[PDB]
Design a protein around this ligand. Structure first.
Ligand SMILES: *[C@@H]1O[C@H](CO)[C@@H](O)[C@H](O)[C@H]1NC(C)=O
Lengths: 217, 216, 319
């Protein structure tokens, strides 16, 4: 019934400064009697259970610092963090507690702001023991790049296909606050011996020209 | 204080049923609502339904009326949720919470449910060398690709864990009803191939351990 | 390969380090030391010293866990040693040595600071040691500014990886070990003094390095205009993408004139055009006002010579 639209998708701001999160509802969540907005903000640490921060669109939960300020009314609600720190890196959700069924928001992911860094692309040919038992799988790595916006594209000496292309993105590092990415080209030994060039391209904001690493069979 | 302990992970087959537990210790269990939340990767949070262990028992969601029946035990403090007709889209993390007037604010530990019909197989690991024809500048990147294993937990350690800096392990990806991941490590060219580099992969489900060196 | 090393004992008094009995002359007997190194690291570093190289700076202090701490610094090596006692006999205990004390890495490239260490326990230590073998060590890498400041690596933003090992594991005699530091994508804000500290349950040793960053400039020459009709002198010489702001001196020369191929140009010339690019590097535009070309200067060509610490001794030329 009630739709909870969270904005934006995922912002990455540096620590210290104030960040803001918006939440829009499909209908009014403000009760006429006992004038409170039945809406709650939840925070979930990476790989853990969510904990409530603000309920009734205001009045923070006990144990939560005063930097988390919840405001808004009607259909538009806002959660502001005056001084972001390392203990605030998580994802937040806005949930309506007014009508059934209870609905949550899409969730805004909080990352750490950094300078742009080009990915470290390195391609790898299939192993010898893999060919004798199974097929052939090409491996391409993209290590330590900012931001997380990245796209990979393969090419087989002119041809190109998305079949057998399984990627894997990592979360933000807990040390250098960078992102990594891997990509595999799972094939068989049969159709691998009939092609020569195998390249792994990318598309990042740092360089206008893609990073191309290829090798001949 | 109040606390909610849930059952362990449930790895089952499609089409079957699953019942999980949720013990509530620290308050009057028959005096508050117990809600169930589903968190599936890529779909956020979803409310399944609440149950009051007293008079007015259950109240289900529109899309969770046939699936996920709710029962409670007033004798021994426990809340149950009986899942039925498990499909591949039912793989998520299920939390039990103590609902209130303004929300939950009291969550459980969580129960991971995974559904598939693949048997328990050992992993197949393969080293990943840059090859002889390469331009190794300063640092050389090595890999340890592990394909063709099921469950989920697998630990990977370089040189028995002595070399953990600059190591990037990627999350598992299911492929042909078998998962697959890879691990990367950056070492200087003055060390490799001057010194041996070995990846040790341990699978606690099949109880296996494989130590493979990276050779050119 | 010097056999004796002059040094200053601070608390400064003159002293000597000897790697058969030299006649002790104008030296106090407490600072005339016959050195014996079971680890063989300091003596090997002194033997591998370049021939004819200047005398390295040396300092000697009193350490408190006798204990003499020797810091030998040079633009070739950096060494820190702990000693243990008419010539006083001394035995080397711990040594931290690096043969890359002044590494110059290009901007944007990865830096690899190398370090080695050697440990020789005293007789009183090994006799009261029930240890299984080599002790567990720690290796800290920090950035220094007249004291201490930011610890970067250990066993940490922007990467900075540290590795350290022995790969000997022989429960007997002195131990040798390697230690490396990797700094990815060196930015101009990361240049300066670095400090490597080896901390053993026995004690601490420290060595100092100076990581400097350079960037070769791009030189180009072309005629100048002013959009006119007539011709007021005006020449140009563009310098692009350089980081060392100091040591830059623009010079002009006429090659192939009626008086050799090394004659500096005459006339007006000015330099003030510089721009800060979006990467920290800078650019420059040189200008020349040559006299009217005579018939005797036919076939010659003007050129602007550029000198910078990021360039060889001959610099770069563009005609
Ligand atoms: C230390 O590095 C040198 C080369 O710089 C190498 O020959 C030696 O084997 C290394 N020692 C260890 C213990 O790895």
């Amino acid at each position: 019934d009630i739709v909870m639209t969270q904005s934006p998708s995922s912002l990455a701001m540096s620590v210290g400064q104030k960040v803001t999160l918006s939440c829009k509802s499909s209908q009014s969540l403000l009760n006429s009697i006992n004038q409170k907005n039945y809406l709650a903000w939840y925070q979930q640490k990476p790989g853990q259970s969510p904990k409530m921060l603000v309920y009734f669109a205001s009045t923070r939960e006990s144990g939560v610092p005063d930097r988390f300020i919840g405001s808004g009314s009607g259909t538009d609600f806002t959660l502001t963090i005056s001084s972001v720190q390392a203990e605030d890196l998580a994802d937040y959700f806005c949930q309506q507690h007014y009508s059934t069924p209870l609905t949550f928001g899409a969730g805004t992911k909080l990352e750490l702001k950094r300078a742009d860094a080009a990915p470290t692309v390195s391609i790898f040919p299939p192993s010898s023991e893999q060919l004798t038992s199974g097929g052939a799988s090409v491996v391409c790595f993209l290590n330590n790049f900012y931001p997380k916006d990245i796209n990979v594209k393969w090419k087989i000496d002119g041809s190109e296909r998305q079949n057998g292309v399984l990627n894997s993105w990592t979360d933000q590092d807990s040390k250098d606050s960078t992102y990594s990415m891997s990509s595999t080209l799972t094939l068989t030994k049969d159709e691998y011996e009939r092609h020569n060039s195998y390249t792994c391209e990318a598309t990042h904001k740092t360089s206008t020209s893609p990073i191309v690493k290829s090798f001949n069979r | 204080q109040v606390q909610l302990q849930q059952s362990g992970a449930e790895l089952v087959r499609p089409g079957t049923s699953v019942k999980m537990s949720c013990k509530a210790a620290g308050y009057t269990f028959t005096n508050y609502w117990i809600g169930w939340i589903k968190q599936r990767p890529g779909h956020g949070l979803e409310w399944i339904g609440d149950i009051y262990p007293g008079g007015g028992y259950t109240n289900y969601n529109e899309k969770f009326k046939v699936k996920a029946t709710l029962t409670a035990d007033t004798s021994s403090v426990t809340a149950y949720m009986q899942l039925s007709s498990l499909t591949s889209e039912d793989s998520a993390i299920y939390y039990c919470t103590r609902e209130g007037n303004y929300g939950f604010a009291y969550w459980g530990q969580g129960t991971l449910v995974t559904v598939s019909a693949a048997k328990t197989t050992p992993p197949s690991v393969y080293p990943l060398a840059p090859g002889s024809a390469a331009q190794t500048n300063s640092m050389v990147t090595l890999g340890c690709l592990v394909k063709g294993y099921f469950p989920e937990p697998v630990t990977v350690t370089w040189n028995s864990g002595s070399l953990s800096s600059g190591v990037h392990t990627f999350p598992a990806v299911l492929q042909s009803d078998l998962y697959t991941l890879s691990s990367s490590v950056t070492v200087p060219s003055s060390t490799w191939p001057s010194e041996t580099v070995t990846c040790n992969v341990a699978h606690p489900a099949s109880s296996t351990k494989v130590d493979k060196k990276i050779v050119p | 390969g010097p056999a004796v090393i002059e040094c200053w004992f601070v608390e400064k008094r003159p002293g000597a380090l000897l790697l058969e009995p030299p006649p002790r002359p104008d030296l106090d007997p407490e600072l005339y030391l016959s050195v014996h190194d079971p680890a063989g690291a300091l003596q090997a570093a002194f033997r591998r010293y370049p021939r004819g190289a200047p005398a390295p700076h040396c300092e000697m202090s009193r350490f408190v866990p006798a204990w003499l701490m020797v810091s030998i610094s040079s633009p070739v090596l950096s060494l820190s040693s702990l000693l243990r006692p008419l010539i006083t006999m001394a035995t080397v205990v711990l040594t931290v040595l690096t043969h890359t004390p002044a590494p110059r890495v290009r901007l944007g490239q990865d830096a690899l600071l190398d370090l080695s260490f050697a440990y020789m326990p005293p007789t009183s230590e090994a006799a009261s040691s029930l240890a299984p073998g080599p002790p567990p060590f720690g290796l800290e890498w920090r950035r220094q500014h007249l004291g201490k400041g930011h610890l970067l690596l250990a066993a940490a933003q922007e990467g900075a990886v540290a590795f350290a090992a022995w790969d000997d594991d022989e429960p007997w005699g002195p131990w040798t070990g390697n230690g490396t530091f990797w700094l990815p994508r060196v930015q101009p804000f990361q240049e300066g003094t670095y400090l490597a500290t080896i901390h053993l349950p026995y004690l601490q040793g420290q060595v100092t390095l100076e990581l400097a960053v350079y960037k070769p400039p791009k030189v180009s020459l072309m005629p100048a205009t002013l959009a006119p009709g007539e011709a007021p002198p005006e020449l140009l010489c563009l310098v692009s993408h350089f980081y060392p702001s100091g040591g830059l001196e623009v010079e002009w020369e006429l090659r192939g004139g009626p008086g050799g191929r090394s004659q500096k140009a005459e006339g007006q010339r000015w330099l003030s055009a510089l721009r800060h690019h979006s990467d920290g590097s800078v650019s420059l535009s040189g200008h020349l006002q040559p006299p009217p070309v005579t018939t005797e200067q036919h076939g010659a060509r003007y050129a602007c010579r550029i000198h910078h610490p990021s360039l060889p001794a001959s610099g770069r030329s563009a005609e």
